[PDB]
């Protein structure tokens, strides 16, 4: 359905932590979209580490290695 995983106040707090002073009303949807995609990409690569490894409970390390798979962004050289 329209199920969301992050609240509007949470989005405002996250943007505040990023130095954002003002937020457009359209940001709430946009962030909520990006987050969904992000989770979809991580959970996918986590499920492979669980289903192809013959388990039904997704441990933390499955998520850790899926996150490593996603690709690390640094801010310099």
């Amino acid at each position: 359905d329209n199920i969301q995983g992050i609240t509007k106040p949470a989005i405002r707090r996250l943007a505040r932590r990023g130095g954002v002073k003002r937020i457009s009303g359209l940001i709430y949807e946009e962030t909520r979209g990006v987050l969904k995609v992000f989770l979809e990409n991580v959970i996918r690569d986590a499920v492979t580490y669980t289903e192809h490894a013959k388990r039904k409970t997704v441990t933390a390390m499955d998520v850790v290695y899926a996150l490593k798979r996603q690709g690390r962004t640094l801010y310099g050289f």
Binding site: R69, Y75, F77
Partner: protein, 153 residues
């Protein structure tokens, strides 16, 4: 584990007019003699809305690449304004330096690019259609985004 390590990128001739070519000084390292192709690309994000307006400005295919530290100036012609949407021409967009090994992109170096008019009149009254001849390109060279991906070497 990764056969190629990108050490540094320097943005040259920046700021510059829009029509000026991009110039990057790339320093990378090969731990081993490369038997497959190394391919560098510069991609201009014409529109943040959609990937379909990307312009691959140039592509350098290198091979075989001997082991050691290599340095070179990647120069690429400025993007085609006829394919850039007006709404995205003026303001902030992205330029990308991609490298691929055996057809797999293992590193993406991104810069934000602020295209602005320099004449205060055009800044107060921007032309209805962007005048690229009067746009200055400011590559935000101080904030590169270096993203590395796991590939099979």
């Amino acid at each position: 584990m990764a056969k190629v390590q990108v050490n540094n990128v320097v943005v040259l001739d920046n700021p510059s007019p829009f029509y000026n070519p991009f110039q990057f000084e790339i320093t990378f390292e090969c731990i081993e003699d490369l038997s497959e192709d190394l391919e560098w690309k510069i991609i201009y994000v014409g529109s943040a809305e959609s990937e379909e307006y990307d312009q691959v400005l140039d592509s350098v295919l290198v091979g075989p690449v001997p082991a050691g530290r290599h340095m070179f100036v990647f120069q690429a012609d400025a993007p085609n304004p006829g394919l850039i949407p007006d709404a995205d021409a003026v303001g902030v967009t992205v330029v990308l330096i991609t490298c691929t090994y055996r057809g797999q992109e293992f590193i993406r170096v991104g810069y934000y690019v602020n295209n602005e008019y320099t004449e205060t009149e055009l800044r107060e009254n921007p032309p209805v259609k962007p005048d690229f001849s009067k746009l200055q390109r400011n590559i935000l060279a101080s904030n590169p985004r270096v993203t590395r991906f796991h590939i099979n070497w």
